[PDB]
């Protein structure tokens, strides 16, 4: 009586029988989508990282600064230690 699925953006699609949520009231279903106010850090990191064209120290410093901007402290520390 139920269908459930996930989405790429953290959305959750859920369709359930009307009886389980609230001639015959068992012949209908309700469809809902749940949304997050989900993985934007992935896109932001992928868009502004530097990978070539500069010496190793500059790349490490730039990546560490970018990581610290988004609040991922451990990644920045890893870049600095590298």
């Amino acid at each position: 009586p139920e269908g459930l699925c996930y989405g790429l953006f953290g959305d959750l699609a859920f369709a359930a029988k009307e009886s389980l949520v609230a001639f015959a009231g068992l012949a209908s279903s309700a469809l809902s989508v749940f949304e997050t106010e989900g993985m934007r850090w992935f896109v932001d990191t992928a868009e502004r990282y530097a990978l070539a064209g500069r010496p190793l120290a500059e790349l490490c410093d730039h990546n560490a600064k970018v990581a610290r901007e988004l609040g991922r402290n451990q990644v920045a520390q890893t870049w600095t230690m590298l």
Partner: protein, 107 residues
């Protein structure tokens, strides 16, 4: 005088400092003094300790929020490797300094 044979130096003993309140300042000054004496591995180790003991890597009370930095391979495992190497070298000075600095973060 055979000070050129032992794995410890008197000048470094005179130049090292240990302030509980500030860790970064102590690490930077120790690195500078080690550079002055002529040890390079000490400079590298002190710089690594400078980075690895920053305040922003403080552990959380709830285990379910994030992986503690001690679990990260650049934490406990790196410290163990350094301790093993210097135990093989029998450098008591560096061992004491590291075991003091890293422990002090626990408070």
């Amino acid at each position: 005088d055979i000070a050129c044979l032992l794995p410890v130096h008197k000048s470094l003993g005179e130049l090292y400092i240990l302030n509980v309140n500030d860790i970064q300042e102590t690490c930077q000054k120790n690195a500078a003094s080690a550079l002055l004496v002529g040890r390079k591995d000490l400079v590298q180790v002190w710089s690594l300790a400078t980075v690895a003991t920053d305040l922003c890597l403080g552990p959380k009370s709830d285990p379910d929020l994030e992986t503690p930095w001690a679990r990260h391979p650049f934490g406990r495992q790196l410290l163990e490797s350094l301790l093993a190497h210097y135990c093989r070298l029998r450098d008591v000075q560096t061992l004491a300094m590291l075991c003091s600095v890293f422990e002090a973060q626990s408070r």
